[PDB]
Amino acid sequence: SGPVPSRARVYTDVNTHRPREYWDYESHVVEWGNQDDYQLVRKLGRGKYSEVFEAINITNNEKVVVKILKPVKKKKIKREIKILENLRGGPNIITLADIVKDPVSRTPALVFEHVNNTDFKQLYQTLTDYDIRFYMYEILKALDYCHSMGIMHRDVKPHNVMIDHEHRKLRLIDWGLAEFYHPGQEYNVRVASRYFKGPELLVDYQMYDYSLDMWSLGCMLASMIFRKEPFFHGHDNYDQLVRIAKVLGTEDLYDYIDKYNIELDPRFNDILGRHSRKRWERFVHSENQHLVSPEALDFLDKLLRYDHQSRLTAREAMEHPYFYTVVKDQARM
Numbered sequence: 534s535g536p537v538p539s540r541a542r543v544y545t546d547v548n549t550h551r552p553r554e555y556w557d558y559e560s561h562v563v564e565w566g567n568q569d570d571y572q573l574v575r576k577l578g579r580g581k582y583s584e585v586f587e588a589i590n591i592t593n594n595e596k597v598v599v600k601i602l603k604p605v606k607k608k609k610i611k612r613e614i615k616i617l618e619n620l621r622g623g624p625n626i627i628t629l630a631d632i633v634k635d636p637v638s639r640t641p642a643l644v645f646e647h648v649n650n651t652d653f654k655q656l657y658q659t660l661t662d663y664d665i666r667f668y669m670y671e672i673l674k675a676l677d678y679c680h681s682m683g684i685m686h687r688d689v690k691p692h693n694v695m696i697d698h699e700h701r702k703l704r705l706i707d708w709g710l711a712e713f714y715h716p717g718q719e720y721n722v723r724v725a726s727r728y729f730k731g732p733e734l735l736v737d738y739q740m741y742d743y744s745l746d747m748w749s750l751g752c753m754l755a756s757m758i759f760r761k762e763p764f765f766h767g768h769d770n771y772d773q774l775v776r777i778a779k780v781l782g783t784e785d786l787y788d789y790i791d792k793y794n795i796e797l798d799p800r801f802n803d804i805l806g807r808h809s810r811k812r813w814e815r816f817v818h819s820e821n822q823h824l825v826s827p828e829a830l831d832f833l834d835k836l837l838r839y840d841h842q843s844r845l846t847a848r849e850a851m852e853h854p855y856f857y858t859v860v861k862d863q864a865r866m
């Protein structure tokens with residue numbers, strides 16, 4: 534009789550109380566700059582949707598980062614721009630500095646504040662127990678802010694977390710998949726990386742919310758404290774849910790499907806089978822035990838839930854005992 538509707542438990546109507554211009558990015562007018570102010574130095578990396586370069590602003594001799602966008606729909610460019618401008622100045626949010634366009638090829642490019650070319654994926658293995666809690670707390674600051682601004686990132690993964698370990702700085706980047714949350718709106722489930730897709734994306738439940746980012750955050754935490762990258766290692770979108778079901782169990786999965794009256798793809802009933810909910814001790818060994826604690830396992834369990842409504846919010850996560858020492862040390866400053 535159709536899926537059961539769902540609402541976010543926090544920041545549900547923040548966009549409703551704002552002017553239309555805040556979230557109606559289709560009508561957003563882009564403030565274009567002059568690309569002659571920037572000279573590219575070297576390429577930093579590629580991607581399906583952009584190429585990233587280190588560049589120099591020749592007007593003030595400032596180092597910047599230039600993201601030349603691949604050809605995508607104009608509304609998607611306006612969405613990333615509007616979200617970056619709404620979140621500008623937020624805690625641990627990357628700063629959009631300028632928007633330029635090649636006068637010949639009409640190719641748009643975003644100019645960001647400079648950050649050291651080193652992300653969370655390259656640094657996790659050398660991090661101590663305290664470093665994991667510290668940087669996870671910094672990620673939660675950025676997530677709680679953008680959620681409070683009515684925006685979900687929808688692509689939380691270590692590759693999108695830039696870290697300057699010398700200064701202990703952290704920046705959340707790549708907002709090309711972020712969207713504004715509106716209660717009752719059905720979103721595209723073809724988002725995020727395979728290993729970080731929430732169960733709602735794999736069962737094709739479109740009325741999701743900020744809680745999607747909290748699942749992806751839980752996938753990062755599990756891979757770091759267990760040193761298993763990725764943690765849920767599926768061969769495809771169907772097998773990705775099977776890998777999750779082999780850990781969280783199938784009974785909670787069918788209760789989740791039953792609660793929201795989700796029409797499960799018939800290709801799943803032959804491959805899901807029957808699996809019990811595993812204990813987190815199964816993934817602990819002598820090489821990751823220094824990163825695993827009862828607080829870490831209790832915090833991880835509250836993030837990786839089938840029911841998106843039962844996962845911790847970003848604000849609830851920041852108050853878990855897992856961060857008690859980090860919060861106390863920041864108060865000492």
Ligand SMILES: Brc1cc2[nH]nnc2nc1Br
Pocket residue numbers: 577585598600627645646647648695706707708
């Ligand atoms: Br700074 C920076 C900002 C980005 N936005 N999307 N990808 C990005 N990469 C780097 Br590096």
